[PDB]
């Protein structure tokens, strides 16, 4: 087999990069470890920045989104018996965010690709990357017992945090920045109407809580829990009682509960690797970095990396300007660090940290009061939340 | 599930550690990604140090070895139209090495374990290690769709170069030392009698060649080839002609050729990670380090790591001396660096390096002439080849 751009991983980053490339005439093959079903079983993200919305429209996969996505003009932070709303539309200069599930985005891309006829090998086991610094790198994998080889010009590692790509770069070539938080998020997907028309982030003495949604009849709730918790110890019943305890009385009494469709614990972490490339291999999305879900930036940073790599591969192929690829990491890291800073900030002011002295608790409370009461303060949250501009 | 020591990987390191532990009364569970067959298909090693031979006898798996293993008292280096023999037995003070295939060693251990009834889960997918710095770490994996959890006291990462263990330690906690060589080894297993009763390492202008064996009717040959070669480009016919071209005329004319049972290319590399542990996780064998096969140290260093970890776990469990585990990395690295140095030395004097000036070629030749003609020189090769003493 031979192609122009080999893509490792069929999550949103890979499918999105593959769809854009295909549309521009650049051949690409996607290699996924799992089955289409397993990829589709992941709930994950729900909030999309305008940049991603526009990127999906450019990739030609925005129909269902334009119809089912919910445009949100504000969010709400609850703390100290208060409920403060941030008017995103007004404070950011007209921008908004779109609520549309990652599963849906993934499904839409899978369908578009199926129709296009571009190559996709699911259940590609034992993927190994070779000759990364050569002019002709290649990928080897096993498909039903037989080992195949795939020759290509460039490789895009879109295999997530545990992918083979990042591990295929000499350890001494990368500098890792990581921070692990002492808690996780217990999420619950239910087929019930959301308690609010906008999201509610809540700082509460018992810990953090978040009220989200997927549609007008499908909700997604989370509560901060210790890393020692097991999902089997949390019955639907127990989850509902705890969520209620962490929300304002008026919000709690309007909550329509119900049996969960999904329940899982996601630990929180910040992770950036520098640089994001090695020879003919370029890392994108979770393969290169992780952000706590608090600021809703994961999927959104994957989109900016992908938009960047796509636009650089277009110049290389279409205009013979391959030197531009050297710039991939610099351009991307600028946006990544700012989104990492915001997600870190959000996480620190909304969560309950263990072993926090009196002074720190007061400063945490004051951070909220100040930022949520100052016009200049609200703007810093809004412009970061809607998403900082993509660099050209 | 719950056990005392969870072991990731059923290659020789894992099976050996598991066998010794079981014998001493310490419960252990082995988790292997592949099937017993795939593990058994790997040819690999053929030369064993006395330390490993004694370790197998202690593990109670030495019968077949004592019967089928071939004790070798010397090896031979051919260069510049000369054939110099190193009397290992004499120069090292009585020590020798044993020729017995890794496949055989693996088979013997698999059988011993099967009989013992100790737990072994093959095809354990998605292995993930958790709470490494806690008092109660655990392992999660999938067995036929269902995700199981395994609680344990300690975890021994014996999953080889591409295992999950080394990747589960925070990147910032490890310092990697690596060197990749510009060539690989094309190996060929044949059902023919070996050209010699002892091994012949050959430095030749066309490149390196090695004449080895598995028994009196089974041989294993290798020739150095560029990293750009594909095994499908090397027919048996082509391999035999090239091997012949790289050996002394008298050795070449006594060669019994024949169809290959196996053919594969192994790239060469040196790799050491420091330290070799993190909390309740200890790395052993290829999970922690790689050596070029030139000095025959890979499997042999796995044995010393395992012997060390085993003896430390015995004090921890039997004598309640768990503080001793802190010493694992220090003890092991001392032996590892010396074996890395020897394997590096062997590789540099026997191989053909690209872009070598006149001076370097002459020094390479002089290294051989000196070391192979000096009694003190031969001793340095012999004592290192038979294997340096295990530290207590
Ligand atoms: C609870 C939670 C809430 C979140 N909320 C938001 C939100 O509201 N908005 C937002 O922007 N972000 C959010 N995020 C994050 C977002 O889900 C991820 O950043 C995003 O899925 C990353 O996409 P990816 O394509 O880089 O990687 P992935 O989705 O992880 O996919 C990588 C793909 O590569 C495959 N793969 C792995 N190894 C190999 C291999 N060796 N060979 C081949 N294939 C391989 C994997 O199977 C996988 O299919 C949230 C995350 C979580 C967990
Ligand atoms: C051509 C060649 C010649 C050699 N010659 C010699 C010689 O003469 N003498 C000598 O001492 N050395 C020699 N060596 C080296 C030796 O073969 C290795 O050092 C040895 O096999 C290492 O044993 P191990 O148990 O650490 O790892 P491995 O043999 O690699 O086994 C690791 C096991 O872990 C499993 N695993 C991997 N990932 C996971 C996961 N995520 N979950 C669970 N299981 C997992 C793997 O499937 C594998 O079964 C040679 C090597 C080669 C390649």
Characterise this structure.
The structure is a homodimer of 392-residue chains. By secondary structure, chain A is an alpha+beta fold. The first copy, chain A, has 2 domains: 240 residues, FAD/NAD(P)-binding domain, CATH 3.50.50; 148 residues, D-Amino Acid Oxidase, subunit A, domain 2 (D-Amino Acid Oxidase, Chain A, domain 2, 2-Layer Sandwich), CATH 3.30.9. Helix content of chain A is 36%, strand content 28%. Chain A contains 13 helices and 20 strands. In chain A, the strands form 4 sheets. In chain A, strands 6-5-14-15-16-13-17-20 form an 8-stranded mixed sheet, with helices on both faces. In chain A, strand 5 and strand 6 form a beta hairpin. In chain A, helix 1 runs parallel beside helix 6, helix 1 runs parallel beside helix 10 and helix 10 runs antiparallel to helix 11. Chain A is globular, with a radius of gyration of 21 Å. The first copy, chain A, starts with a strand and ends in a 6-residue tail after the last helix. The interface between A and B is small, with 10 and 10 residues. One flavin-adenine dinucleotide binds next to helix 1, strand 13 and helix 10 of chain B.
